[PDB]
Write a protein that binds this ligand. Structure first.
Ligand code: CPU
Ligand code: CPU
Lengths: 541, 487
């Protein structure tokens, strides 16, 4: 089966026609005097040349102005002398946006396993606000398998060639497909052809229910679009001889590098990658040193924080970027605050999820502070090479089902006990019921990803306690003045909100966010909220 | 032997207790007035940077050791950009505010050497304060003082090493010191590219028989001009897919695969700049997808829409200087010729407008070979370097020439397709740059362009052949930027 939706009216709102009305009436003219040129059944003259893409938009402006003027005062209704459908058109088109519960509805049946597509009487917009159309088309691009623009194939609606063509392409029966239009007039030949006829009047809503009817039912407030994965661009920068950083790119300027934590990947930002791009940013979801597709040198000094933060600038340098908004989480969160602290120039901004900014005490061995905190026992476990590796690597499937679990779920990790029992996955089963937070596929990704690096490299992040301490002690007399945002997770066992109360001592103006009922895996666990926040922040500052 | 420079006022001009350490790095900026503008209002010293890349290219160890500071300022980015840019030309960056030891504290000099790993006589220090050069000469270093805006300066420079020009070529990005993108637009098909700079986007599209490396001279500059550059490897070339089938290189297919490329990358609009064959594609991009095109620029290639009542083929058969195009028309043949010895093949193709050893564009069929007239070991063009050539060899050693040649082999359908937009006009911003001495693709072939593209802005480079970019880069840049800036 397949679903195909018209853009203006069903996937995109408010229909361009809408404004055609409030311009007709607005300009006091005979019902459909203007919507005539647009949709009427007998497309002739200029607009027929338009949807067929014989002439572009700007051309069609004059041709149509004058053609209106014919039927104008020179045939009933008084159309002003100095009148033009150009600015009313481009503005109503620019002022039109995506029908989420619809696009949402579309992504569903695609997930369900449907043939998702759009069939619209399009045109080639060479206008000033020609971009608006491009963005709407850029982002809609993913969700649909096929795009049949009247202005590309040369057969406007409701001429049958298009419908008869919509099928040859979809290679299917007309009953096999369902047609969503907002004119009904374009729907007549669709029904008559043995296809499903659903008039998208309203704003979906009801057409969403007489829609639920066949196929299935759709969410109430679904999950934000997660970039997923072969469909993405893959960057590769070589910052130093043996060392190269892999990453994923989406969206256009300005730049914001998403840095992940232990034991994850760039795929962790899957839910934020798209949205943020769409938020109007060039996203760079990077695979941190030692992870997935970037270099994983075995040596430990190789993961010193000083080294990673510097290798971070080298990364921007080679890419030719002078400044980025750094958004860290978990371990990276640390790095990220360090980025802000040591390279403010290259940092347009900083955001940390869960990780507070915890500068060291000069008169307190770094090690002792770990030995003291009871919930950092695992950190000590890790401290020894070969050991934790051996445990985590043994059966990667469990290892992840174990680590990634919600705040309200059993099958946990032994952050407290670790050392005694000799593991974190020592009291965990050998078949952890898969978290309601991940999918077997999502898990499998991480497996393959780690099947390439093992865990040494990632673990070595922990193993630099001392020098990391020695280094960061250099900025104890500094303040973090570039824009910062700290987001805390209510139920994150290690890395608890409480660990940040004294943050403003160093980071005044530090703006803040807080997600409730949320565990460690902030992004994967409460994405929509993570997004809302991150965007608002980016927009606002 | 190595060389050091001091940002403070040597690689960047106009020159610029509690400061005794802001520099050492204990305190930041705002951790402190009208001095920020001063920093902003300052920039790179091109002959110095030039001089530097010279020595770097001469096989020296290039570096900067400066009394820095950390900027949490508002005009912070200015510093980034300068630093972002200088970065590629220096090996080590010894910034006071980083290793904690301002100049002239002798620890820095001691450290620059331990870092550099060499004798103090093996290096030459370039400071503009001289009071910072005492210890340097003291240590047994080579001290040059930056008094003039770098004249008698880089003069004493030329002395110690050798001669750097005055009006030089613009810095050429490379080689693998660049980012490498990879997008998979369709099952077997993926497009490789190179990225530099931050927004907005401009995709540089190359011609036959080249690569993204062809834009080497424009890639940096343009980034620095304030743009996110995407020097792409066209279908069939270098690191992107090279499917053997011909239909696979139809123009309609490439222009569409072009939108797919922007889509996956999440970009809604780009400025498309084409040259040679791509130039064609690029104008088609403008013609079929104006939405995704913020702009269009073509180098050499005019916009030549087809005649409905004139078989496309006949127009090639008619023009005498498109004989080679006919040669190419047959599969296996031209491949076999060009592939045989790639070294010659490129030395032959890439030559200036004022050089012999040419290509048989005219008599290709007749002599049966676009190289038959070409020497056997073409004296390497003064326009390329053995290394630059070698790049292209390896690049093509991966795809052969079928894929690239198939660009030619779609004459008919390309015609049939483009005939769809004969009733259209190109209204998005366009710029046509013509090359005086480009044998095929002569300026003359564009006089009627505005018939279709009014407002079409224009540029023209003199004494220039086909390889516009490689041949007259600085002029190409000047123009492309001015255009981008202005529109
Ligand atoms: O796996 C981790 N890893 C945390 C590293 C935290 C950290 C990073 C940097 C400095 C101090 C602490 N945390 C989760 C595991 C599942 C239960 C709750 C904590
Ligand atoms: O290699 C080429 N290739 C040109 C393809 C030109 C073209 C492509 C599409 C439409 C019209 C013309 N040109 C050089 C060859 C060596 C001598 C100068 C021209």
């Amino acid at each position: 089966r397949v679903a195909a939706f018209d853009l203006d009216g069903v996937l995109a709102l408010p229909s361009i026609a809408g404004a055609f009305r409030r311009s007709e009436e607005a300009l006091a003219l005979p019902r459909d005097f203007l919507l005539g040129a647009y949709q009427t059944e007998f497309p002739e003259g200029p607009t027929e040349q338009l949807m067929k893409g014989k002439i572009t938009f700007s051309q069609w402006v004059p041709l149509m102005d004058e053609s209106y003027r014919k039927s104008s005062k020179a045939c009933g209704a008084n159309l002003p002398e100095n009148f033009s459908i150009s600015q009313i058109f481009s503005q109503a088109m620019a002022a039109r946006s995506i029908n989420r519960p619809m696009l949402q509805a579309a992504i569903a049946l695609k997930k369900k396993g449907f043939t998702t597509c759009i069939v619209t009487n399009n045109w080639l917009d060479d206008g000033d606000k020609r971009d608006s159309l491009a963005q709407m088309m850029c982002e809609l691009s993913q969700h649909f398998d096929f795009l049949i623009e009247s202005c590309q194939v040369g057969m406007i609606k409701p001429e049958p060639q298009i419908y008869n063509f919509l099928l040859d392409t979809l290679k299917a029966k007309p009953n096999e497909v369902v047609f969503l239009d907002d004119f009904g007039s374009n729907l007549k030949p669709a029904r008559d052809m043995g296809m499903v006829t659903i008039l998208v009047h309203n704003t979906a809503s009801a057409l969403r229910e007489l829609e639920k009817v066949t196929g299935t039912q759709f969410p109430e407030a679904p999950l934000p679009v997660p970039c997923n994965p072969n469909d993405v661009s893959h960057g590769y920068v070589t910052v130093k001889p043996g060392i190269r950083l892999h990453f994923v790119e989406m969206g256009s300027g300005p730049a914001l590098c998403l840095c992940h934590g232990f034991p994850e990947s760039w795929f962790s930002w899957r839910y934020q990658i798209p949205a943020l791009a769409q938020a109007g940013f060039r996203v760079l979801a990077i695979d941190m040193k030692g992870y997935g597709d970037s270099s994983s040198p075995p040596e430990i000094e190789e993961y010193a924080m000083e080294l990673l933060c510097k290798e971070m600038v080298t990364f921007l340098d080679k890419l030719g970027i002078p400044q980025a908004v750094f958004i860290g989480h978990d371990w990276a969160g640390v790095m990220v605050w360090n980025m802000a602290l040591f390279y403010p120039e290259r940092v347009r901004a900083v955001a940390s999820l869960n990780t507070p900014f915890m500068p060291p005490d000069p008169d307190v061995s770094p090690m002792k502070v770990i030995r003291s905190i009871p919930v950092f026992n695992y950190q000590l476990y890790f401290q020894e090479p070969g050991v934790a590796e051996a445990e985590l690597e043994k059966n990667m499937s469990r290892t992840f089902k174990s680590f990634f679990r919600a705040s309200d779920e059993t099958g946990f990790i032994a952050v407290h006990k670790a050392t005694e029992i000799g593991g974190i996955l020592v009291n965990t089963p050998e078949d952890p019921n898969l978290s309601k937070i991940t999918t077997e596929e999502e898990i499998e990704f991480y497996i393959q990803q780690f099947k390439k690096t093992g865990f040494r490299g990632p673990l070595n992040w922990y193993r630099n306690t001392e020098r990391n301490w020695k280094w960061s002690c250099k900025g104890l007399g500094r303040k973090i003045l570039v824009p910062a945002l700290m987001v805390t997770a209510e139920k994150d066992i290690v890395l608890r909100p409480e660990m940040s109360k004294n943050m403003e001592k160093w980071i005044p103006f530090l703006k803040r966010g807080h997600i409730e009922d949320c565990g460690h895996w902030t992004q994967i666990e409460k994405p929509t909220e993570v997004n809302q926040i991150l965007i608002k922040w980016l927009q606002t500052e």
